[PDB]
Symmetry: C2
Amino acid sequence: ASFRVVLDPGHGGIDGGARGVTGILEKDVTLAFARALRDELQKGSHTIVALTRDSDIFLRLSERVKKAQEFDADLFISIHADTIDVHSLRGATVYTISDEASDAIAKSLAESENKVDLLDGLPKEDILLDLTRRETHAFSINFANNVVSNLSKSHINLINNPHRYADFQVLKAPDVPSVLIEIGYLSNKEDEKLLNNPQWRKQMAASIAYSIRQFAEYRQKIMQPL
Amino acid sequence: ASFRVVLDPGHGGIDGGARGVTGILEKDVTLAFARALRDELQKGSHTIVALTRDSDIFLRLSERVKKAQEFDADLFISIHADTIDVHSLRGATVYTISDEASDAIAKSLAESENKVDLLDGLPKEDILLDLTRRETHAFSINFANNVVSNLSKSHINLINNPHRYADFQVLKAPDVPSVLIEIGYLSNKEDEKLLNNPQWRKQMAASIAYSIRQFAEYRQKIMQPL
Ligand SMILES: [Zn+2]
Ligand SMILES: [Zn+2]
């Protein structure tokens, strides 16, 4: 069966996201990275990919989640390259959702990343469900773990404690495993140099694509009892 | 939190299980292995272990499952060293439950292993539930995968296609992740030599204990939304 993946290039349109010292914008880096990851996935077999946006447009976080659900996604990956409070912090990071943040950096990052909805100048927006949520979370965690493992094997630099968590609204799908990947932090000058290198970006995308293939193979082993 | 594991030494009492050429009995090997795995787990931190039997007694498969549930187990491992139809087949194997067998060897093995209940000479014995079952199965699969991965890293010999599946009644807990591990096959002369070596058994138990620790760390990352 074809495994279904939705990629969400963070920011877009009026929301440029973080800005590097060279002028490079997060919204452009995330779209370029998403396109590279799509390409890597499409080189493989049995993965069908869609992007929340494949152009420079603004989308509310809830609309990104809705697109993943409308696609019947098996996995949702939101792609970012943010500024964080400490400029010395650098390296790939994977975040999953949690009410309680793993640490102060993660907490502050989610607070800021959730607020971008307001940039359009418009206002802010069951047991069976809770069980589904728990199952989804197990999958999100599994994927995050695998991504970190394979990035490490590929000698791609990871931040200390590279699996973190906080209350990211873009990760709220109750029924689609979801992670947010910081490919690097535009607040760090060394990460900015990696982020603007398309060959480095391709190498990271290739590692994530491998992780996705492994996750697909795992998911397809699981029973369907309904 | 203390991760809760129930180990099930296959067979027991009137059911000797498979018999090696040296006279060694499966029921004795599985109890010895379970005790070694208990010891390895108890050397670690944060694992609480119980055995379905810690003596030479016969237990129906349903009673083994009930004991896992009564203990509020987070993981159930049934330990075996069976005879299979092809004597040239050897190596550690992990089985998970499925209505449809992975292959003819797995199918025949489950048929035979389910029939042991009859050795006492007595007769043979919901959406929310189905969802719980699906979640449990994801965990069973995850653990099986990790066990195979770590056995390989430890240079412990694995059978070809070392993750298999069939309709094993001892793996029927809807709410406890469950696997059946063949530590080797007493139908194979080389496996018999490994099986009777307590140092080799200890090395395999140590690898499984490591896999359990990794599984515990994973399980404890997952949300509790109820
Ligand atoms: Zn961002
Ligand atoms: Zn057996």
